[PDB]
Each structure stands twice: as C-alpha cells, then as structure tokens.
C-alpha cells in the first residue's frame, strides 16, 4: 500500500477489537447511532493508548538520567490535526488503514472531521511546532511551554467578497491528544505593590490567577520517544474571587471570575504587528509566571533534591537548564527569573544575572518596526511593578557597561537604552532579550546579517559573540510523508526510508535526474496530487478548476511587505493581454490565493476584496475561456496547506528584499515538487543557493537596491509614467473596472501604491512579469520542468528542522542529538 | 463482611486489571506518582464501565418497545456522591472493597475523595435525586432534566462565627459521571419581537443560545435498568456572537460570549424565596426550551415515525409524554408548548390545549407567600414576547371558564387572575400551573388539605378533580444502606433483604421488639456510629465531644420557619439551669446544629452568628463539663447527611405548624434509629401516625392553634411576662452575655422575636422545653429508648420514595411500575 508502515496480523486485531472497546466504554455509542465523528473519536482513543506508554517511560527516564532540559517558550504552538501524523510517527498509519477497512470504514474520511489545533497565526506558530516535532526525534529532553487558548486563530469566511471573521471553537467536541493535570496547578499574581523591607523588596497585595497545565504528547519519529508540551489554562481562585467582602453580590462575584480567565481566552490574531494591549501583557507574563515556576521545581528535584553539593547552589542551574525565547513575547522570563532568584531565593544581584544569561537564549523573528514590542511604562508600572524595577536595575548595569566600553558617546548610549523616551516611555523588549540572553539568533543568513549591520549594530559591537544564525527549517514528517505519500513512495523505492530522518541523503537523487521512469514517476505524483485538490475543491467549496494548467499559488498571512498585491499586478496583466490577442496561445494557469488578514488591517482586508473582485471579472469572461482562473482559498491553515501545497507547480515567495526574516511556507513546496519564482529575500537565498540559480527564478531588487533606491527617493509616479501596461491596470482599478457598483471602492490601494508604497511594488513590476515569462516557457517543456522539479526536491534537505535543532542544540544549548531508539514501549508497571 | 454482595474471584481479579488499566490508559500515570485522588478517578471508571452495558440497552430498550415516557423537570438535582451509590444499585461494593484491598487501597479512604454534585439547595432538589433513583428502580422510562451549573450551591466557612461563602468549583477535577453529547446541541431563544402575519404569529429577531446537553446515569436497584439525567449546559453560537458586525472589536466579541454562558453558570442560592431577577428567567425559560425540543423529537419518532395513523397527530402525544412540573420553576413549559403546537406545527388553540393540560402536572411545595414566583410582566415582555401573549391568552379563556361557573362574581375573578394588578404587573405562576396541567398534587396529606382550603381554594372550587397529595418519600439505598451498612445488615439478619426495594417490609421487624439480641444490636449500630462520627468531627475539624452524650441534632436549611432559634432558647434554658444547679444530675448532651444561609438573607446568617456565640459560651464554661456542648456543623451537605444522620438521637423537627410543607430530613433520621421532637407540621403527621403517637415526641401548637391565636393577634410580650425563664434569656442577649465585645449585636434577633415574630417562637416554648425534659427522661432508660427506636424503624416503610413514585406513577402519569430485571448486562454489540 505504500511505506506507512507493516499491516500485521496480530496487530489490526488488537486494533479493531480497542477501536470497539473505545466506542463502547468511551463513547458509549452502538454501532447503530455511531456517526462519523463518533468513529474518529474511536480511532483517536484507540491510537493514542499506543503512545502513553512510551510517554510514562519518557518522561520517567528524563527523570533518572537528570539530563539537561530544553524549554521551549512561545506564545504560539500552530499544530494543525495530530492523527495522522502519530501514526505516522508510530509506524501505524497501514495497520490502522486496514483494521479501520475491515472494520468498513474509511479512515481519510474520519481523518477529515478532526479539527485543527490553531493555536497560532503563521510561521511563527508553525515553527515551533516543527520544532517540537524534531527536538523529539532527536532525542531531546525538550519541552513546549505555552497557553492553551480555548479560541485560537479564527475562521475566515468570504461573503460577498469580504473577509468574516468567527470565532474557532475548537474544543466543542473535545480534545482526546490533551491531559489535564489540575493537581499540578500554580498561582500567578498581578497589580499590588513593592515593599522594601531591611533584608529585601516584597511584591504585595496582589491578584491571584491560577495556572492549570494540560500536557500534550509529542512523539519522535519512530524512535519510542514522546516529549510534553504542556499549555496553561487561566483558573479563578475561589476564595478572594468571592472572598474580598462587604457587598456587591454573591452572583456577580460568581460571574465575574470570567474576567481572570479571560486571559487564556483567546490568541491575539495579529502577525508580525504589534498590539499594546494589557490583555496580550497578561497572557505574556502569565505563561512566563507559570512556565518558570515548574522549571525551578524540576530542578530543585533533579539530583539535587537528594544531594550533590547540599545547598541549593543555583551555580548548576544553566547546566540543567536552557531556556529558549521564540521572539520577545515571552521576554519577561528575564526579569521574571531574576526576581525569584534575587526576591525569593535570596541570591545576590550578580550572581543572579550571571545565571539568568546563562540560561536565556533569544531568537529574533522580524525587522519592521511595527512588529517591535515596546510595552508603555505606565502599563507594565500598575500590571508587574517589581518587574519595571528591576529592568530599571538591569538597563542602569547594562548602560554602565557601555558607557564603560565607548567613553564619550552619549548617543550610543540612548540608542542602546531598554527604556525609550518621548511622547510616553516604553520598554524596549528586544533590548532586554539581548541584554538578559547569551545568544541572539536571526532565522535566515541575510536577516541574520541585518540584525548585526543594522537593528541590532551597537549590541554586535558590544558584544559580537551573542549573536548567531540558525536558518529555519520544516519537518519532512508532516511536510512530506504525512501531505505526499505519493512522493515519499517513489524516493523511498530508489533511495531507502533512512531519508525521513535524514533529509540530506535526498542528494542521492540527483543521479536520477536523467533516469526516464522516475521523471515519468514525479511527474505522474504531481499529477495525482493536482487531480485530488481539484476534486477538493469542487467537493467542500464548488465551481471548477482545470488540473491541466499551472498551478501558480501564494499562501500565507496578507500582508502589504508579503506583496499578494504584486501578485495581483500580474494576474491582471495576464488577463488584459489575452483580452488583447483572445486567439493567440498562451499557457492556462489557475493561481490560487490565500491567507489571513488581520481583523484590524484595513489595507489587508482591501488586498482580499480586490482578489475576489479580479476573480469575477476574469473567471465569467467567456473570452478567457480555461486559459486563466483566479480562485481565493478560503481559511488558509495547516490542514489546508497540506492539501494545496502538494498540488502546487509555482511558489510565490515575493516579499520585498530584506522584509521576510526567512519564510518556511517557502521550503514546504521545495520539497514537494513546485518551482520557486521569487526574490532574493530571507531563506530563499540559501534555496537558490543549494539548488543553484539555474533552478531557480529569481527576479526584482536586492537588498542593496532597495537601499540605493531609498537614498534616491522611491517615487511611482516614474513606474507609473514609463509603463502602459501599468499604468492601464492603475487606471481599470481607478475607474471601477473591477468594481462596477462601487467605482471609487478600491481609491485607497491605487492611492497607497502611488503615494505611500513602504514596499515599492512597481519598482519590481516589470522583472517580475518578464520572469513570469520564462517559467511559462519552461512549463511549456514538461520533461524539462520535471527535470529542474527533481533538481530542488533533491537540495531541499538542508531545509529540515532536524539540521535546525542540531544546530541549536549544539550552538547555543549546549546538548548532543541522539537517533537512539528508546528501549520500545513495552508494558511495565512498577 | 456484610451483603454488599458477593466478592466472587473471576469479579475481583477483572476488577483490578481494569482499575490499571485506567489508572495507566485513562489518568496516564503510574503507580509511583499516583495520588489517592488518582486512584479514585481509576476506580470510578471501572466502576462506571460496568453500567454502560446497562445504559446503553436500558436506552435501546425504550426506543423498541416505545413506552410512556416520564419528563422530570426540575431546576434543581441535589445529587451528592455518586461512587458508592452505583456500586450498591450494581450490587459491586463487597468486591471493590475486596480489589482495592488487595491492592492495597482504602476503599472509604478513597470515597471521600469524590466532590458532591451540589445541584440543589435543599428539600426541592433532593427530593428529585430521590425521585430518579426509585423511578429507575420501579423501571420507569424516566428522563431527569436539568441545568448543568458549574457552580453549585456555595461552600459554607465559619469565620470568626460568621458565613463566608465560595465558590463550589465542583467541576474544578472533572465529572467521571457525565458523558458530554455536543451532537444534540439545541438552539434556544431570547427577546426579539412578535410578527403577526397572514397565517400566525412569528417569534422575530431573537438572540440565540445553544444548549449542550450532559448525560448522567442513573441505575436503578439491581434490576440493570440504567436510565438517564439531562443536563442542559448554554454554549454561545460562533455566528452572530461575532457576525453581527460594524465595529467593537473582534477580541472583545470573543470575551464577551461569557454571557450568554453566564445562563448556566450558578445556581440561585435560594431556599424558599423567591428572587425576580433576570438570570434567573433565562435559566428557567433556558431548560424548558431545549428540554421540550427533545421531547418533540423523540415523540416524533416513536412508532408515529415509522407509521401509525400518518399524519403527525398531537392527539397521541398525551399517551407516550408526561411532563412533571417540580414547583413552579419550570412552568413555561405550558406556554411554550402552546407555542411549539400552535406557532409552529400549526395545531388550533383548543385542541393544543387540550393536548398540554393532559400531559402537565404541577407540585406545590410551599405556601409562604415570600417563595411563590410572581414574575414582572415588563420582565416577561422584554424577553419573551410571544409567552406572554399565550399567558394573556390562556388567562383570557381561563377567566371565561369561571365568570361562567361562577356568575357574578367578580372578586373572585380578580383572585383567580394569572395577571396580579397593583404597583407593577405580575404573573402568577402558580396559577398558570393549575389552570394548564390535569393535575396539582402537594407533598403531605396536612400541605395537600391547606391547598384546598387556603391557597388555591378558588381553583380547588372550579375543578376539585386536579387536586391531590402525594406525601413525599426519601430512597433506602442511599440513606439506609448507603449510609448505614451496620444497622441494614442487622435488619438483614432477621428479615432478609427484600425490604430494601419493598420497605413496608420492615414491619416484620415489630415482633423483635422484645428480643434481646436485637435490642442489643440496634442499641450497637447506633453507638458505633457515634463513635466513628465522634471521630470524623476530630478529624476534619478539630476540639472533640463525648459519644456517651445524647446527639441532639437539627440540620436542614437556615430559615425564621424552622425555628433554629427556638433550639437556641432551649439550649440556653439547658444553660442556665446548669449554672443554678452546678451539682444536680442532667443527661449529657452534644447538640448540633448546622445548614446553610441565603447570602443575602440577613436574619438567617444573624441566627448562625448566634449559634456560635452560645457555644464560645457553653463551650468554654468549667462548671458544665462535658455535660453540654453547642455545635454548629459546617458546609451541612447531602455527604454530610450522610454522616450526622446515622448518629443522632434526637431529630429536631420544630417548624411552626402550617409552614413546613413536609420536610424530608425527618424521614432519614425515623430510618436510621432516632427519635423525633417535633410539631404537627408537614410530614410530621403521618410518621407520628404510622408510629403510634406514644412513641413521638409531639408538642406545641397544631395548626388551628396558629390560626386562633392570629385571630386574636399574636404578642410576644405576653410570655416574656409570663416566663422568667425565657425573660432571663432574652435579657442575657439583649445586655451582651452572649457577645461580650459587642453588646448590642443581637439586638435584631431581640427585636424580631419581640415585635415581628411572624413564626410565634415564644408561643411554643414552654410546650418545647417540657417535652424535652420527657426525652431526656426516656434517653435515661436505654432499653426502653432503643425499644421505641425499633418502633419508630419498624414503621418508616411507608416513606420510601418507591411508595411515592408508585402513586404519581398510577395516579397522575398513568404508568405502572416494574420490579422486572431488565435482561442482564450481557456484552452485545450490533
Ligand atoms: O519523587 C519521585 N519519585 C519517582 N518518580 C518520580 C518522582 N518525581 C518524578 N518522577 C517521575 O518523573 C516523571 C517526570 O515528572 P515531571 O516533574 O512532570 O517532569 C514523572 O511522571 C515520574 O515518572
Ligand atoms: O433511528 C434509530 N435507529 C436505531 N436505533 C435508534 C434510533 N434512534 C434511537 N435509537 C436507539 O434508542 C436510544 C435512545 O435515544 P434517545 O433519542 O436519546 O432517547 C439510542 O441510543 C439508540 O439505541
Ligand atoms: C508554513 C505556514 C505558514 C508560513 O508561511 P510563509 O509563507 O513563511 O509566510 C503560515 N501559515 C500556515 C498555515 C503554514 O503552514
Ligand atoms: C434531606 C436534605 C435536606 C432536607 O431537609 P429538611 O429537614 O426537610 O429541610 C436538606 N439538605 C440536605 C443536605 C438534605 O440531605
Ligand atoms: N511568521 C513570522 O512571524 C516570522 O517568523 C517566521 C519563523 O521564524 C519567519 O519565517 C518569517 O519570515 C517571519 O515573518
Ligand atoms: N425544601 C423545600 O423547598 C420544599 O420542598 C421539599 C420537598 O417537597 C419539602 O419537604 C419542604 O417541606 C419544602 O419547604
């Protein structure tokens, strides 16, 4: 059937006979009312019995050995479904196919009805579950600390054109992957006040939430090792949040403890943007509070907690511990630990601050100004008051440092300031992560050197040895053998499985480059995979696609650096030519679109409009005819990218050169079998550069250009003035071409685009057209499109995250990989 | 060890392989981390295993054979822990205790751990926990619905003698019971507006909530019939609760869907008295629509879903539904059913009608006016329009009815009015009860009579046919052989067991009323229940009392009607004498009082405050030694009945006569070996009279007593001149004996007792404290107190609930009962 594993005997038994006990004992449902859902609810119980006992011997190992912990935290896990890929990274995705078969049922089907843990917005939340995902098949003793949002990102619905949001009830039915752990619940406090009393500061009168864990599992690949990741739940106490008396009501006071729980309530739905807002503060120190108080506990345990010295000497802490911050959402676990080191366990300030850096270690996401975190000092001074102390206390440290290090100069010094003056003073995030960690890493080469050469310049001068690179990377697990089976077979019978977990040894194929039945092989996958989208698409959303077209599609968060708006430049160009020469031929291509827009993103929210507006021009001209359709892909998430991705043939990666930190959704169709056509801007480089430029169409400005243009001036008039075809598409959109009813509707795109493009979509409008050409060409030539589709899958594997955490691992926590299988699962009950 | 069943050796072996299984599989934990409270949860799923068999064709059972079914809506459900009482009905106990054993855990140890399911506030909602059981085990298809509050009634703490009350977050470690059925979700609605178009009404722009329903079982006694409590849980829609757009915030509208929640999120504290606040409506109108819409549904399918006459005749409807009505709680249950019939299957008024009088009946419980429920009609106007246009509607034709009985009558008119005149409109929602159900029952014989001739007298003149009584019942499983394993098993020795579902039998038991080794046994039971609650009280709560002592116990709610402060005059009297004659004899008493008080309910939580203070007194006090100990029982709950009952002595029964519509806690201790003081109120009648008058302890005034004496004009003055007893008394609170900082804070309960007595505490207190000097007598002769015990326990057969359930089953649903063992458990999987 495919390499998802054996379908053995006693095995599809013993899974049917569980698969009934579950719907019976679980479910408590008769074959003659069980629906659908019931069903995969059946499955999921029965495939997750198979990993708890590897959990409790996972975990129980950590325990004995006492081996150096990785915590991992991040204010977004984006998981997707979990299923599939636990069976697949249990070797039982065939028995269950089988067992599921006999049973008379479809296991796809059932596959279909989990709902998608969304606990994300993009690459950001997405990273970190790959992360997961390798740190596990490493062999790490890694965990994920984050908040378990009862609503995550929301669903977007299209009407009448228009972006809707609802809410993302994905706990409905119930979650079977998670294990509430209230026994382990701790308190988090907030507001009161500092008292300084003779032998030390005491943070008093403060408001208690409590942090509830529910632990999630994360198995390796088929090496029996299954990590934690536990998300905390916000938990009113029942006492002050009722107690604190003298009149108000016993009901009202009932009702209001929705009011301390609304902190892990909802994921804040905003992508490299951000939001001052008190909510977010909570969530962000709440999750910190929580997270740090379980790391100390386990290490107060550890081997410790029974001898060693004798004398909790937190000198050994960054021995056992490394903690990582995925952007500086969680950076207050800075000032965080200092304050249960120094206020609570008594330490002096130095010793405190040697061991907090130890620990620390940050890693940088984005270089736009407006997704930078600079909390207001008023804020955080009433939310966490001990906490602005003591950054005080490190800025004051810090400054004297450099003072020390560039005598005289006084503007290094503001500029390298945590605490920002003007209108009102902020606290500069980013500044406290460099000052508080001991390494800072950017996600990509190129945004790597930016953060050295410009956001971060005077940090690098001080201190060059923080600073590192660690390119991002995506889990073939998912990536690959989850979403294409179809692809993974036919590399697998030439090459072996030894690839799934070493993704570089996809360099073998390279020698079948020339080989007849495997171009034949990739060309024919693709070509399921396209069939089996176009089907999905007329099944769950309707109207009709051709699957003999090039599939030319661009998902990801709307965004106006991310450019869908060039995209949409040269759809309409595509269209205005063929209106021009209807009989002449051209290549037929559906380009699909997809993506998120922020709630409050006005210009984000206009991008959508005009996509679906472009749509019902093109898609009803009859002169058009299959040549060119323009299709929007509804609430673009994980399960929906494992569905398109594999069906694509182009990539869109466009993002104006030096704004995309490095991108991921970029590395997902490398490795399964779509052309690349973008510009030389994050991780895209190292693609192009392992698969060499011939494979690759690269187009547009580079970093530099985009420098020398902003000394000129970026002025679009002069694009606008030196090119007709342009400047007819600027004009259709200003006289109501694609928007008959509303003539003016779309004033404030044509408005933005001449007057306030901050990413100069005209200066690469004609390289990117002209490029456009060349991959039309190509395409036109299979066996050669083929041939180059063969050349980026075989140099995708530096792109996996199993290299990434290697690095991160080694570089920067201090640890050794290991693809040791953990002694099976076997039974035991001690 | 005693007929907690057999501990067979294939049972106890299956036992504790799946008590690991679960403990491993189902908690994820193993045995070196695991917690009493975790080996709880494992052996509540085990237990829970053995019942889904049973649920599951008990279920399948009603839908082949398509019996009359009984709705049971209550707002209330007061249903306590459940792990023992399911291993009795499954007759599981002896081996569970065995397993556990051998596996080296304590069973009781373990018990203790289970929350109790505080759905209730006192009498009313346990009376319906009662009610499911002996309908499940008269095999009765029998639905329970409910509310799911995810906060109970408040736990009660004494601080510094005061009430403080929290939160009960019974929920807090989950519910091992219910089984979440999010399938069945239901929509129901509120507000909007009434369009009157062409053919019928139309309910307009309503806001929508969605109920989610939880499914308890409820296993009846050893007859494997399992069948079910539905709790209704509100889930905001993910549509409107967002989509209804044009600014506001897309976080906020996301926080804010805790409020269509709020419908179930606490239970109204109130224990006869009625509060008019709009939460409350919500609840009540909130499961009454989606419990009805459930009853159509199944109605619709019945064998009328299949074939029948064909054509959806209502006219059947009365013969498979039979809706009970427990208070007045749930009564828009007959507008909404008019509502449903008429509005939406189109039926004409009348012969609606005629289908919902025949398939309501409506319980009374009260007839203090401060507890009926008068409901404001702008309320009703406001957020459901179109119930009351049926009520006007209904009340309209109603009011015919009796112009034309009752010719020229016109006050009588305005009495019988479901629409009250004066300051603000009101609906009475008693009299939309009697005049839309085919029968109104009260709950003792006395209550019933009162009915007729006060309360509903009018309406009793109009249709004297509607009228009954149905004296209420408490069930022997849990409050005899639940609580008291030692005295059924004695019993058991001489009359075997079949008294259990057939309690009358326990008659047999007045031929050992002269034989020596029962005398003894009783006399043991009882002694070594004192003892191990002696203990209890030591062990949870800390500063002993003497088991040799007589237990004087009053529990039940704190109210002015039940008299807590006539216990407290005569536990001072006791006091005061002592401190006369330090040096005369006096039996040895250890009087406990305990329940719980309305937070807002001032007099009530002053009366607690009292209770206290005589016992810092009494307590403390040299020179009465152990000869008399005043103590308040915290957070009185039905786990806690479970404990103090078995050990009392004396039970405190001392209502105004004419107040106490029946009571039910008199019926547990009759049960379980104590002797009643009491008045001629409620209940109290009848068990007087099944146990002969000379073996009661009746005193003060009767009811006709009451009435003269307000004819007259009741003066307090008048008997504080009279006694110098009770003047000393009244002056010792009055000058600050009692609260010595201070002096003046009793002085509310001075001035009520004195000038707004409206339940006459003085006018019984000497007939009070006479009569406890006979049973003081008596308790001096054991032999003969244990005699009149056998008296009072060979008698209580006639209130079980199975007696009760018997009668509303043959008199008003127009069922009969069944002690027929459904066809085993047996496996099975179709
Ligand atoms: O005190 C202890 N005795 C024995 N095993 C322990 C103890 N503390 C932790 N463990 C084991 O280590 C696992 C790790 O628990 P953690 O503290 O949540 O990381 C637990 O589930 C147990 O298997
Ligand atoms: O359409 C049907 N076919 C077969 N069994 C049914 C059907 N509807 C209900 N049942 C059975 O009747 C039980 C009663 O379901 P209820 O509707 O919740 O009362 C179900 O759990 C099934 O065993
Ligand atoms: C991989 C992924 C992303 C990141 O895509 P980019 O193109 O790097 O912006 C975002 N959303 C989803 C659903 C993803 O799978
Ligand atoms: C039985 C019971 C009641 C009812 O007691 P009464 O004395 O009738 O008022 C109230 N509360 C609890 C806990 C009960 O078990
Ligand atoms: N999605 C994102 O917010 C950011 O982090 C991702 C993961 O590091 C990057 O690939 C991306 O370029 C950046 O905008
Ligand atoms: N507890 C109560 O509210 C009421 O209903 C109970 C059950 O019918 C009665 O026994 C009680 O006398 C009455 O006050």
């Known amino acids: 059937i495919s390499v998802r594993g054996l379908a053995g005997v006693e095995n599809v038994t013993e899974l049917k006979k569980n698969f009934n006990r579950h719907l ?9 009312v069980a629906t659908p859902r019931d069903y995969y609810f059946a499955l999921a119980h029965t495939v997750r019995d198979h990993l708890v006992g590897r959990w409790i011997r996972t975990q129980q190992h950590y325990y004995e050995k006492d ?22 990274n249990l070797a039982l995705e065939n028995a269950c196919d089988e067992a599921t078969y006999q049973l008379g049922l479809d296991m796809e089907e059932l596959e279909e009805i989990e709902e998608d843990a969304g606990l994300g917005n993009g690459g950001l939340g997405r990273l970190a579950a790959c992360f997961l995902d390798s740190m596990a098949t490493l062999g790490l003793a890694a965990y994920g600390y984050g908040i378990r949002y009862e609503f995550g990102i929301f669903n977007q619905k299209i009407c009448g054109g228009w972006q809707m949001e609802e809410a993302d009830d994905w706990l409905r039915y119930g979650n079977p992957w998670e294990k509430a752990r209230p026994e ?33 599992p994360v198995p390796g690949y088929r090496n029996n090792v299954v990590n934690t990741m536990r998300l905390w739940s916000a938990k009113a106490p029942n006492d002050f949040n009722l107690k604190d008396f003298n009149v108000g009501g016993y009901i009202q006071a009932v009702l209001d403890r929705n009011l301390a729980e609304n902190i892990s309530r909802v994921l804040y739905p905003n992508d490299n943007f951000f939001e001052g807002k008190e909510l977010r503060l909570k ?26 010295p004798v004398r909790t000497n937190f000198d050994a802490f960054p021995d056992k511990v490394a903690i990582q911050l995925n952007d500086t959402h969680p950076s207050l676990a800075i000032p965080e630990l200092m304050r249960v080191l120094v206020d609570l366990e008594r330490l002096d300030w130095d010793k405190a601050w040697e061991v907090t850096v130890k620990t620390c270690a940050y890693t940088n996401h984005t270089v736009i100004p407006e997704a930078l975190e600079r909390w207001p000092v008023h804020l955080l001074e009433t939310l966490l008051p001990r906490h602005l102390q003591i950054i005080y206390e490190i800025n004051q440290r810090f400054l004297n440092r450099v003072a020390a290090a560039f005598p005289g100069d006084v503007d290094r010094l503001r500029r390298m300031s945590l605490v920002e003056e003007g209108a009102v003073k902020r606290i500069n995030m980013a500044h406290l992560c460099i000052a508080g960690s001991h390494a800072v890493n950017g996600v990509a080469r190129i945004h790597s050197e930016i953060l050295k050469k410009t956001i971060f310049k005077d940090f690098y001068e001080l201190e060059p040895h923080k600073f590192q690179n660690k390119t991002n990377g995506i889990t073939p697990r998912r990536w690959l053998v989850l979403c294409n089976p179809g692809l993974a077979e036919i ?5 072996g499985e030894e690839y799934i977990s070493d993704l570089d040894q996809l360099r073998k194929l390279l020698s079948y480059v020339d080989d007849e039945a495997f171009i034949r092989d990739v060309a024919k996958v693709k070509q399921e995979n396209k069939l089996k989208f ?8 309707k109207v009709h696609i051709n699957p003999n077209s090039l599939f030319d599609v661009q998902v990801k968060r709307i965004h106006e650096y991310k450019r869908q708006l060039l995209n949409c430049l040269h759809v309409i160009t595509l269209y205005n030519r063929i209106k021009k020469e209807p009989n002449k031929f051209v290549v037929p291509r559906t380009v699909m679109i997809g993506g998120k827009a922020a709630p409050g993103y006005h210009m984000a929210k206009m991008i959508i409009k005009l996509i679906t507006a472009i749509g019902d021009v ?14 929007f892909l509804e609430n673009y998430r994980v399960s929906l990218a494992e569905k398109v991705i594999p069906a694509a043939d182009l990539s869109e990666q466009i993002s104006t050169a030096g704004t995309e930190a490095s991108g991921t959704g970029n590395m997902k169709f490398m490795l399964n079998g779509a052309l690349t056509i973008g510009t030389m801007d994050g991780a895209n480089v190292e693609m192009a550069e392992e698969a060499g430029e011939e494979n690759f169409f690269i187009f547009g400005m580079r970093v530099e250009d985009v420098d020398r243009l902003d000394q000129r001036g970026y002025n679009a008039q ?6 007709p075809e342009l400047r007819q598409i600027i004009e259709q959109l200003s006289s109501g071409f694609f928007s008959p009813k509303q003539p003016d509707l779309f004033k404030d795109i044509v408005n933005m685009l001449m007057h306030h493009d901050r990413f100069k979509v005209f200066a690469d409008y004609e390289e990117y057209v002209k490029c456009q050409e060349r991959v039309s060409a190509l395409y036109k030539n299979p066996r050669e499109w083929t041939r180059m589709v063969i050349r980026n899958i075989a140099t995708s594997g530096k792109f996996s995250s199993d290299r990434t955490i290697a690095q991160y691992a080694r570089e920067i926590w201090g640890v050794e990989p290991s693809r040791q299988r953990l002694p099976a699962p076997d039974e035991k009950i001690p």
């Not at 002069?718 to 090119?723: G, K, L, N």
């Open 491 to 495: 590399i697998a019978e030439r090459i």
């Open 24 to 32: 019976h004992f679980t479910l408590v449902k008769d074959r003659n």
């Open 283 to 308: 969530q962000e120190y709440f999750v910190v509070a929580a997270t740090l108080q379980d790391i100390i506990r386990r290490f107060k345990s550890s081997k410790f907690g029974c001898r060693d």
């Open 718 to 723: 002069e694009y606008y003035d030196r090119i």
């Open 534 to 541: 176009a089907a999905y698409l007329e099944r769950e959303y």
């Open 184 to 216: 382990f619940t701790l308190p988090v406090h907030f507001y009161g006040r500092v008292e300084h009393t003779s032998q030390g500061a005491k943070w008093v009168d403060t408001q208690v939430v409590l942090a509830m864990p529910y632990d999630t």
């Open 618 to 631: 093109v898609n009803h001209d009859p002169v058009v005819g299959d040549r060119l359709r323009v299709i």
């Open 67 to 88: 081996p150096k912990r990785i915590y991992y935290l991040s204010l977004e896990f984006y998981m997707g479904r979990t299923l599939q890929n636990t069976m697949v």
